[PDB]
Symmetry: none
Subunit: 121 residues, 2 copies
C-alpha cells in the first residue's frame, strides 16, 4: 500500500516522501504521466510501469509484509502479487534514493514545466 511505499521511500531516501514525491516531474504523483524529466522522475515512471504488471492486488490499498533488515528492504511477503507489489515499491525507494543527487525541487512545480508524451512502459 501507500503506507508501505511511503515508508520504504523514506527509509531509502531519508527524505520526506510526501513532500519530495507527491508531485514531482511528469510521473511522480497521482495525476501524472509524461516523459520523465530526470532520473527521479524516471524512477516513478518505472514504478508506475511496475504497478501495471500486477494482477490480483491493489497497489494503493493493499498491505503487505516487508522488513528492514540490515537497512535494506526485504520483501518477505509470500503472496506473489503482494511480493511483486512490495518489490515495485522497494525498487522505487532505492531508485529514488539513488537519484537524490539530481533531485530538483523545481520539478515539484508542476506549473513551471511541461510534460512530453508519456514514455511507454
Amino acid at each position: 500500500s501507500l503506507i508501505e511505499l511511503t515508508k520504504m521511500v523514506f527509509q531509502e531516501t531519508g527524505k520526506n516522501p510526501v513532500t519530495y514525491y507527491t508531485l514531482y516531474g511528469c510521473n511522480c504523483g497521482v495525476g501524472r504521466r509524461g516523459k520523465p524529466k530526470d532520473a527521479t522522475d524516471r524512477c516513478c515512471f518505472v514504478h508506475r510501469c511496475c504497478y501495471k504488471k500486477l494482477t490480483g492486488c491493489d497497489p494503493k490499498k493493499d498491505r503487505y509484509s516487508y522488513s528492514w533488515e540490515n537497512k535494506a528492504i526485504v520483501c518477505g511477503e509470500k503472496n506473489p502479487c503482494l511480493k511483486e507489489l512490495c518489490e515495485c515499491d522497494k525498487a522505487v525507494a532505492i531508485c529514488l534514493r539513488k537519484n537524490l543527487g539530481t533531485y530538483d525541487k523545481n520539478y515539484r512545480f508542476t506549473m513551471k514545466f511541461l510534460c512530453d508524451k508519456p514514455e511507454k512502459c
Copy 2:
C-alpha cells in the same frame, strides 16, 4: 518548521494534514501556486504570503516554541522572526479549521482542476 506547522494544522483541524493538505487546490502543499480555488486554498496562499513577509528565519527548518493552551495555539516563541513564523503557521491552522465548512475533497486531485495565475500577496 513543518513539524510545528503540521502539528498546528492537525491541532486546529483535527484532520491528517498529510492527506488533507499535502495537496489541495493551487496553494496547499509544496510547489503549488495559483489563484486560490476556495477558502481552504486561500488559507494556504495567505500562509505562503505570510512566510513571504518573514525576514530572518526559515519557515521550513526553524523549530519554534508554541504551546497549546486551552486548545488554542500560543506562539510563546520570544525570538521575533520565529514567533512571526509561528503566527503564520498558527494562522493557517486556524484558517484551515475555520474553512473546513467548505473543504472540497475534489481540490486534492491536481488533474481535476486548473490553477489560474497566482494572485499576488
